[PDB]
Amino acid sequence: GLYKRPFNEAFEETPMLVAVLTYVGYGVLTLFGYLRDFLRYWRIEKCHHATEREEQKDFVSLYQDFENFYTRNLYMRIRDNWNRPICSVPGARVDIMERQSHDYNWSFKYTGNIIKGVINMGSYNYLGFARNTGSCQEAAAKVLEEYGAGVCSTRQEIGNLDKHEELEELVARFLGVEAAMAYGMGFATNSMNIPALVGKGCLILSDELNHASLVLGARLSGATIRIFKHNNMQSLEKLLKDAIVYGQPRTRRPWKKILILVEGIYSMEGSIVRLPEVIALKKKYKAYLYLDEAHSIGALGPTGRGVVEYFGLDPEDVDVMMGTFTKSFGASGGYIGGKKELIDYLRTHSHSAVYATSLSPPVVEQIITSMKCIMGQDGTSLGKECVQQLAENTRYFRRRLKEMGFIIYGNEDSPVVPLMLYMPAKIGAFGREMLKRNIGVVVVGFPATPIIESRARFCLSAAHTKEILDTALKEIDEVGDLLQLKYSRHRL
Amino acid sequence: VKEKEELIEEWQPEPLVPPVPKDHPALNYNIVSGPPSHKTVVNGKECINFASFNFLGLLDNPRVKAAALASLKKYGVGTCGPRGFYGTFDVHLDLEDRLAKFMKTEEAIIYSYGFATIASAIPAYSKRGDIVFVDRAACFAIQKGLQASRSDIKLFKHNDMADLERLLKEQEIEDQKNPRKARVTRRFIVVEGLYMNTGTICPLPELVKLKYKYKARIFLEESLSFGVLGEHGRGVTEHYGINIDDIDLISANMENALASIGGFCCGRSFVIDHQRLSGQGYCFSASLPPLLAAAAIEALNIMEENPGIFAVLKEKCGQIHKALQGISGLKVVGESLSPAFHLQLEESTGSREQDVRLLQEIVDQCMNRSIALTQARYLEKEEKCLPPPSIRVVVTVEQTEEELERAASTIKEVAQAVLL
Amino acid sequence: MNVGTAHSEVNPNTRVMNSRGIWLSYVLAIGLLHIVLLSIPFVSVPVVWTLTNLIHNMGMYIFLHTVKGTPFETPDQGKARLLTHWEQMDYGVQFTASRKFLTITPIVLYFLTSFYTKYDQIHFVLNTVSLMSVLIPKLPQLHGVRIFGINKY
Amino acid sequence: RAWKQMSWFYYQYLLVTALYMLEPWERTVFNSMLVSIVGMALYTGYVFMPQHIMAILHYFEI
């Protein structure tokens, strides 16, 4: 397969000095954690933890202490960066309730003051559909007044409604596939529909960076799971060759099926999947394709049909097209699209179709209005402006950050910008300093990522204007000067 | 290289989805032309709702709709992120506090999906090497939770404590064989307050005694009993009077009684605080939309304001269960206290498909007669213990006495005509 | 942070030894320990080298072969609560550049300390028993075996 | 001006050595251990090692 347009991505390497200092910091933290555990065990220092009731003291201990090591010794120190409560619509500006801790993040108390007008770079609204006032909100209010909030039964039983059928046909038209089915949770979509498609005796090939839902869905089904490297089509090709040739491990028989699980945009890495080469490989080796499009269904594409439109490919090549309405459309949910036979088989044999409650009516109304706005059935020019503004903001932000000397991951087109910090203390420092300057960001640490690579992710939006981006960029420059976060050799 | 090549060439994969016969009843979906409520319209036929898990009739309450509308105007529809990353609203914390105060417990955690609640709660505590004693008639959510965990699963007969004691005693023998492993193995007992498949209640006092005797923790599922049982409707613990502190973890969903999407787990801080970091459905998924949380809070306020609705529901369940007794070919399975019970075929013929067809004939003829019934749906190849096919009868405080008598009568004539 | 947020590995621990700059950091750590030992006035150079070898081997034994499990909760549902770090490394693949480096470096330190200890008998027996203590578990034959039931549970 | 620069240098030392997250008594323990090691090293160098390095530093200062 070939690319009609250039495919630009950069993953700079960690400078050796920074790696050495990273390991120094982690070693110091480990040693002081062991000391703190020794102090707490001998009751020399009182432990601020809940303990089991006296009636159950002779039972086997519920948890293993070593498993909680990183939680007490390292996570607790910088716990204030996460779980920040908000009290406003998560737009371009958000209101964060303030909290203070006097026992080093072990317990939090909410002061009266609330921070207002924080620039929001943690929420997932790519097209800026999270508004408390709009046409979508009015339609949702009307359907809430009519249908009520929530349904009390299952789809196969009396719980199926007409709104759900309307949403399913609208989604099928939107993606370009023949049929689609909607679910009430994006995580449940994968976790409950990967087991139905594939069972024991089949092979599943997973990327290194698959979401937890895809991995859980693969585990629940009995299929063998083999992991190829991130966007390495040499690894995928070699795994396909060996799987077809050698067969099953215990008794070398042909695999019943081979399923390849991939994603459109990887949120943390920032990269976009090399879809043309994956499609070429699956056609050559007769393997099926499962494409998760949670992050790319609204952000990518000239009009917004996803990665398949972005590359210009054919939707009929992708066997299963998963997706989530939470990120772009601004309402919770999930969907799978494909052939009519596949959709009917899922309608009969999906776990959530049989046992789990169907989606709330106001949510499907909000999804319908948002999707009609995106494809332009209403006739308003809001559909094109949001996508164009998202693309412009992405390019401007990424370019001007790269020209300040930072290290950034991923393609030039992806609207997620992971900046790299590389040091455990700089995670907490960056989070606190950015909040102090009215900017909200998301930071991740060692158990989540590779040990050397610790990052802060920015999620751009069509709601961010040039003024907001310029303010954020000047604040980021000031912080990077303060914390010395410009590790880029190519640029200064 | 060439032998590798046509080894690649000769292989042929099985089709992704098996060819589906059109005879599947689950293929055809009932289409409800409006909200599923009292006096609903199904398939274009006006009917009285006897299939929706709406026990208290809070789905259509103007107070709930007003609260949901106010919260929708304040926040919108979407939360746009997990609870870790700017997805926590003040309504979520308020709802968790309200649930903790309502159930008289230290802490509660809310998930955005009823299935994920227990399917994520169970694997968080039960790991590989542990021992889980789970009832045979356990819903599919519990089964998927136990499969996600890799612990050893031991099944015992439904509501039978002799089999539980037998398994516990064999475990004590294996304990005596090797103490070193015995000191690091944890034992759990997963039960349900009011079983959905069979409509039968569980023996809590015996379970608590066995817990304290054999050092095994207890996990309880209260999906159906959360809003129907007890003087204040706090579950089966209030029904039996058992102290809630004996039960380690109590999980339920907000869909049935509270009539909004979501689910929750309640317990002491010691057990609950682990799920905030190890519950997969919690860590890696978006939070509950604010309007649903506000609807749940308003439903809790209504439930706390007056406690007589539970008594009304209890008396209606008693009346309908007494009335349905005496059908020729159909037997009632369940208890008088249960709101949702079953009607099964007394004489079971060899084929399950034809049993399903007979029950479908009964259901269709009832629907033509303005009684909207349903049939319990299962995944035949997936369930560990597949229950018999049955017609589900559900009772709601809204249904008047005369409507209950007409429903029982109509089911009676339809069943007698069909079985004849 | 939670395990699995930015990668699909059930056990990140198995790869911490293959990361970038870990080997150079290990070497610099040994050098820093040696310099800290040299900082002691009354201690003499051969017993400095004996102390360097003994402390290095003791710490390496404690970390690689004594402590078992994972410091963080892992979503594979406890593969490796019983396995030690050496057994966990690389999912049980017996040879690897990391394993070869880790098992080669104590022998190099032993040769250096034997040279600088003036080949004395007491130092020889101490250093050699320490080297045997470290090198015996590294054998592929001794994988997941506990002698006399020590550290099994 | 020198005070601000030294404060910035101490800030960088905290960030690099991960002392930024440790509690004050842990910071003091680590600092005391470090200064003790530095003092013992300089004293041992002065007792045994020749002061040619000190002479080189003095010549560079001049």
Side-chain angles (χ1 to χ4, degrees), chain B residues 64-183:
Chain B
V64 179
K65 287 181 182 176
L69 179 55
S71 183
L72 157 72
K73 293 186 181 308
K74 184 171 205 305
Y75 301 103
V77 179
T79 54
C80 296
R83 291 283 293 266
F85 313 141
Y86 303 104
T88 314
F89 287 79
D90 55 357
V91 293
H92 293 95
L93 306 173
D94 297 348
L95 175 51
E96 291 184 6
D97 291 331
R98 293 300 311 271
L99 288 167
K101 288 190 297 181
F102 179 83
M103 271 275 198
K104 288 191 171 179
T105 318
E106 299 189 11
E107 200 161 342
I109 179 171
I110 58 169
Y111 296 75
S112 42
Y113 202 57
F115 205 111
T117 301
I118 191 69
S120 307
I122 293 185
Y125 307 105
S126 186
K127 312 283 188 185
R128 206 177 309 264
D130 298 358
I131 301 299
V132 178
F133 303 104
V134 60
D135 197 298
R136 224 182 259 282
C139 57
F140 204 59
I142 294 185
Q143 305 184 9
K144 296 289 101 176
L146 294 175
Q147 188 197 7
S149 60
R150 301 303 188 190
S151 60
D152 308 350
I153 298 104
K154 311 214 174 309
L155 292 167
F156 64 94
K157 283 181 51 184
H158 175 78
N159 275 343
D160 201 13
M161 301 305 168
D163 208 5
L164 192 46
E165 290 183 354
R166 189 208 78 180
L167 286 161
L168 286 168
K169 281 172 181 176
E170 311 206 350
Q171 182 54 38
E172 196 174 1
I173 295 174
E174 292 291 328
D175 196 275
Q176 283 284 330
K177 290 175 53 183
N178 188 3
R180 294 261 291 191
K181 174 186 302 222
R183 298 219 268 288

Side-chain angles (χ1 to χ4, degrees), chain A residues 3 71 264 358:
Chain A
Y3 303 87
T71 299
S358 65

Side-chain angles (χ1 to χ4, degrees), chain B residues 126-128 180 274 278, chain C residues 73 76-77 79 81 149 153:
Chain B
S126 186
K127 312 283 188 185
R128 206 177 309 264
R180 294 261 291 191
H274 186 73
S278 188
Chain C
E73 181 145 310
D76 56 351
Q77 304 292 127
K79 298 288 94 175
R81 289 182 179 178
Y153 286 139

Side-chain angles (χ1 to χ4, degrees), chain B residues 197-215:
Chain B
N197 299 352
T198 81
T200 57
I201 193 166
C202 73
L204 281 178
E206 284 91 9
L207 271 181
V208 174
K209 294 168 189 171
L210 260 59
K211 164 168 86 75
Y212 280 128
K213 186 139 69 82
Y214 286 91
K215 323 295 170 195

Side-chain angles (χ1 to χ4, degrees), chain A residues 14 23 66-67 208 219 447-448, chain C residues 1 6 8 19-20 71 75 81:
Chain A
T14 312
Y23 293 118
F66 194 47
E67 284 189 343
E208 261 176 350
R219 291 211 276 127
Chain C
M1 270 286 285
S8 170
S19 172
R20 189 186 194 267
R81 289 182 179 178

